[PDB]
């Protein structure tokens, strides 16, 4: 027997009033500070109340398949980083005084970031695709944009993350983004995203404008109200 | 003797060499021994009466 007879068991039993209880997770019983307790039951009021459609369209969003292509298309068009803008001017100050620089050169097509840059060139019918982040903090800034879009016949999409959309342009956040022109070779992928988007967003407004997005109770409550509908069912179903 | 004096005194002046010595009175120690006995023993007795009540049923 390779077992020393002394190793016995001493198994504990945590019944009520029995041996002391051990430590389990309690994340659902913790006195969280007044800023966590705030931001969690902010995301609840955002489900319990009856949400207006224009704020609600920003909940339904793009998917893993569509958004990854968009975020791939933009990686060929990111506006010049700093120290990347430096060599666009510096190379033109040396090319001008040495090798026949007229300096009008064709500014290669790039994105456009801000709201009051995009809403000008959508009001102008000058944008192929508009990308909207769904989590802008004052939603006032983008509440209108989707309706302004489809009224001008411009395909708009709603992607997730004002951060990763504000990561193509080199900033922290960025609410919108827009392709005005595209390279001729990149035209195939641009026309492919476009039709796949406006089938889901632009040609849908009479389903979006008439869609309220809350009025769901908490599951502690749904389990109670539906438990009285198995009583009322089994009262006149048996 | 006044409590802050117990710092000067020696270990044997402050206790008496037994179980619970210097804190319990040895008339309540010799009870806490033969009370901690039969509490366990009649937990064994209920353990086998519970093991025979489930062996019968």
């Amino acid at each position: 027997k390779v077992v020393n007879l002394l190793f016995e068991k001493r198994p504990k039993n945590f019944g009520i009033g029995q041996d002391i209880q051990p430590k389990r997770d309690l994340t659902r019983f913790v006195k969280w500070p007044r800023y966590i307790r705030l931001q969690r039951q902010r995301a609840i009021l955002y489900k319990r109340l009856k949400v207006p459609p224009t704020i609600n369209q920003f909940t339904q969003a793009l998917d893993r398949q569509t958004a990854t292509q968009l975020l791939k298309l933009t990686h060929k068009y990111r506006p010049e980083t700093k120290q990347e803008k430096k060599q666009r001017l510096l190379a033109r100050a040396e090319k001008k005084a040495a090798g026949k620089g007229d300096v009008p050169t064709k500014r290669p097509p790039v994105l456009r970031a801000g709201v009051n840059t995009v809403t000008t060139l959508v009001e102008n019918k000058k944008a192929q695709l508009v990308v909207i982040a769904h989590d802008v903090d004052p939603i006032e800034l983008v509440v209108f944009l989707p309706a302004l879009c489809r009224k001008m016949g411009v395909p708009y999409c709603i992607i997730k993350g004002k951060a990763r959309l504000g990561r193509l342009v080199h900033r922290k956040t960025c609410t919108t983004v827009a392709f005005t022109q595209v390279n001729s070779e990149d035209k195939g992928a641009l026309a492919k995203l476009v039709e796949a988007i406006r089938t889901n967003y632009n040609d849908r407004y009479n389903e979006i404008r008439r869609h309220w997005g809350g009025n769901v109770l908490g599951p502690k409550s749904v389990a109670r109200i539906t438990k009285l509908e198995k009583a009322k069912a089994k009262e006149l179903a048996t | 003797v006044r409590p802050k004096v117990l710092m000067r005194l020696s270990k044997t002046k402050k206790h008496v060499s037994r179980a619970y010595g210097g804190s319990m009175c040895a008339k309540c120690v010799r009870d806490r021994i033969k009370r901690a006995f039969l509490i366990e023993e009649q937990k064994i007795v209920v353990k086998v009466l519970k093991a025979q009540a489930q062996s019968q049923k």
């Binding site: 009520i16 009033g17 002391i20 209880q21 | -």
Partner: protein, 49 residues
């Protein structure tokens, strides 16, 4: 306690979460004596205290 006609009772449970001994002050029901076992809760049985 002063200012009250009822006597209080220091009843010692033991906290079933941390090794310690919670002690309370129940308004003593008539019949309670020292050394009695006071049981509490839903599954307790119906007798004095």
């Amino acid at each position: 306690d002063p200012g009250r006609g009822a006597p209080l009772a220091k009843v010692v449970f033991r906290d079933p979460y941390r090794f310690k001994k919670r002690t309370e002050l129940f308004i003593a029901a008539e019949g309670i004596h020292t050394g009695q076992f006071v049981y509490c809760g839903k599954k307790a049985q119906l007798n004095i205290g």
